[PDB]
Amino acid sequence: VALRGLGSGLQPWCPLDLRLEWVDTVWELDFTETEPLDPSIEAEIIETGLAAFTKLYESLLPFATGEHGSMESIWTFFIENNVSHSTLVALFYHFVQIVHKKNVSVQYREYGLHAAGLYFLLLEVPGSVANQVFHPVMFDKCIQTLKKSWPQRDLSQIRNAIFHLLKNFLRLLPKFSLKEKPQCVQNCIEVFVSLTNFEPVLHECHVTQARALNQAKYIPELAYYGLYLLCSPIHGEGDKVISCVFHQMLSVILMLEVGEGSHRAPLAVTSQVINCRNQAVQFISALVDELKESIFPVVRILLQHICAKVVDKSEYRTFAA
Amino acid sequence: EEITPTIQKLKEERSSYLEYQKVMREIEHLSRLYIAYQFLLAEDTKVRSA
Amino acid sequence: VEILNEHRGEKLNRVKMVEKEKDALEGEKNIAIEFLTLENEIFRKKNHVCQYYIYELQKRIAEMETQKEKIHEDLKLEQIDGHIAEHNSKIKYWHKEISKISNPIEEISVLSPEDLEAIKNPDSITNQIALLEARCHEMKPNLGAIAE
Amino acid sequence: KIKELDHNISKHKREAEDGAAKVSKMLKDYDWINAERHLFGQPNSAYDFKTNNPKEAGQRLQKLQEMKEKLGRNVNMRAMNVLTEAEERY
């Protein structure tokens, strides 16, 4: 059910009014924006909806696992069936572009986030990166839609789609090295920081590089997992990445909202953010046990930043204490 | 209307740098094509020499 | 007219109302331009050191041509092996066209047997590329020194 | 005679590995075994670049783009900061 599964996923996804020229124009538009897709293609996507996306998921699962990751694979099957992976990437990115708009219905948000998850699954095939699949601008935009999927029982479906996309991206993250792309460090760690403030997380999380995809059902735990993945020198190159992430968490350590300065209002004293700061201290302590060297001067510089920027509140003083 | 030429100049700088990064990625993949061919030539030299 | 003149004196004032931000910016960019000239000089030294590597290779080539010519004078396959290693070093000689700035690329220094080897002076290998890396990390260049 | 040639062949075979300028060590470094034959489709040529004699390509175009050392990356950073200031001023 691999080749036949890929074909069965491909009849709703290789239509008769498919514009490869639209895909090529979006490819040479540097993947910054997407013009509206065809009525036929999106009609054939919705005619079965997210069930077709799961059909594409079981179409790609033997190929992404590795028993069909060979010469007899996605690329040769696509060559013999006259299929492009670029058009699937363009469909995924148009669903991302749908998610970028604020006043968007919930099912379109789920379609976009699962589309980006299927894009990451297509990226997860080894050797598929060299076949002109990855583009940084659309990757940064689909990272940004994790922050932009909030509406600006909807939220459970939205967080389940976010959870599936974050599972696929956190699975893709150990294969990919952040050596040549330090711009995600700002981008994706910023969307981690923005996505910490979604749900209260009751239990203190012990964060390693072995937490499973479905083990952490909470977005701060998965963000901590991504940060602990990014502590490696292959992924966090130099001390600039560590200083940037330290300044990133510096906002949430200070018991304050997003932003900087005294114009930003102080956060209300809630035990959920007390639990979150205890998880931050536990994750930082896990980072300390591992580095036992580099972490000391960088956290001293962060403590210098802490002493530079204080808020005189007795509850805040107690928490910082 | 004084910062607008400066804004236009900075937009020219960022669009030019975006073109320069696209040039970097394109000729980097062009070098990566012979990096793949260099893998092939490496394997051919090892197999031929053995 | 004097009241109109006052605002003209004020015009003279606010053409450069503070001048310290522009002086500091042109000082920093002048530091960047001096870093560019200094890194160009260190880069010229690095081209010289790579030229010392090409002349170490070529001087070794000329010496082993002399020894294989002695072998041919005197055994045929030993001369052939000398010719093969000489041709292998001439194949490796491609780096003589040092494409870093091509200039010190083909230009030699005075002391060919002593100063024109790069593997015998690792300080010239290390300190110049370290200076070049420190400058290219600290460059931020712009003609805004000259422009401002 | 042929044993001396075999010594040359053995020296070349052992010299394939364990060098950045050499050919097999960079195979070990990249581990590009997603293609066993590292050609895909058809091999074009050995003329756009060369393994034995490198720096013969459009790396001249890479260097010509690398004439400038100016970090116009923060303006090209997708925070769109100069146009963010433009939109804030508008």
Swiss-Prot record, chain A:
Q: Give the record's subunit note.
A: Component of the condensin-2 complex, which contains the SMC2 and SMC4 heterodimer, and 3 non SMC subunits that probably regulate the complex: NCAPH2, NCAPD3 and NCAPG2. Interacts with BRD4 (isoform B), leading to insulate chromatin from DNA damage response pathway.
Quote the function comment for this protein. Answer: Regulatory subunit of the condensin-2 complex, a complex which establishes mitotic chromosome architecture and is involved in physical rigidity of the chromatid axis. May promote the resolution of double-strand DNA catenanes (intertwines) between sister chromatids. Condensin-mediated compaction likely increases tension in catenated sister chromatids, providing directionality for type II topoisomerase-mediated strand exchanges toward chromatid decatenation. Specifically required for decatenation of centromeric ultrafine DNA bridges during anaphase.
Instruction: Say which species the protein is native to.
Output: Homo sapiens (Human)
Instruction: Tell me where in or outside the cell this protein is found.
Output: Nucleus
Full protein name: Condensin-2 complex subunit D3
Q: Which residues of the full protein are shown?
A: 2 to 375 of 1498
What disease does the Swiss-Prot or TrEMBL record associate with this chain? Microcephaly 22, primary, autosomal recessive: A form of microcephaly, a disease defined as a head circumference more than 3 standard deviations below the age, sex and ethnically matched mean. Brain weight is markedly reduced and the cerebral cortex is disproportionately small.
| Top-level lineage group | Eukaryota
Swiss-Prot record, chain C:
Explain the purpose of this protein: Central component of the condensin complex, a complex required for conversion of interphase chromatin into mitotic-like condense chromosomes. The condensin complex probably introduces positive supercoils into relaxed DNA in the presence of type I topoisomerases and converts nicked DNA into positive knotted forms in the presence of type II topoisomerases.
Q: Which part of the entire sequence is included in the shown chain?
A: 274 to 1095 of 1288
* Source domain of life: Eukaryota
* Organism of this sequence: Homo sapiens (Human)
Q: Where in the cell is it found?
A: Nucleus; Cytoplasm; Chromosome
Q: In which tissues is it expressed?
A: Widely expressed. Higher expression in testis, colon, thymus.
Question: What family is this?
Answer: Belongs to the SMC family. SMC4 subfamily.
Which protein are we looking at?
Answer: Structural maintenance of chromosomes protein 4
UniProt free text on domains: The SMC hinge domain, which separates the large intramolecular coiled coil regions, allows the heterodimerization with SMC2, forming a V-shaped heterodimer.
Q: Give residues where Phosphoserine occurs.
A: 109
Task: State which gene encodes it.
Answer: SMC4
Q: How does it assemble?
A: Forms a heterodimer with SMC2. Component of the condensin complex, which contains the SMC2 and SMC4 heterodimer, and three non SMC subunits that probably regulate the complex: BRRN1/CAPH, CNAP1/CAPD2 and CAPG.
From Swiss-Prot, chain D:
What does its UniProt record remark on the domains? The SMC hinge domain, which separates the large intramolecular coiled coil regions, allows the heterodimerization with SMC4, forming a V-shaped heterodimer.
Q: What does this protein do?
A: Central component of the condensin complex, a complex required for conversion of interphase chromatin into mitotic-like condense chromosomes. The condensin complex probably introduces positive supercoils into relaxed DNA in the presence of type I topoisomerases and converts nicked DNA into positive knotted forms in the presence of type II topoisomerases.
UniProt lists the gene as SMC2
Question: How does this polypeptide assemble, per the annotation?
Answer: Forms a heterodimer with SMC4. Component of the condensin complex, which contains the SMC2 and SMC4 heterodimer, and three non SMC subunits that probably regulate the complex: BRRN1/CAPH, CNAP1/CAPD2 and CAPG. Interacts with BRD4 (isoform B), leading to insulate chromatin from DNA damage response pathway.
User: To which protein family does this belong?
Assistant: Belongs to the SMC family. SMC2 subfamily.
Q: Where in the cell is it found?
A: Nucleus; Cytoplasm; Chromosome
This one is known as Structural maintenance of chromosomes protein 2
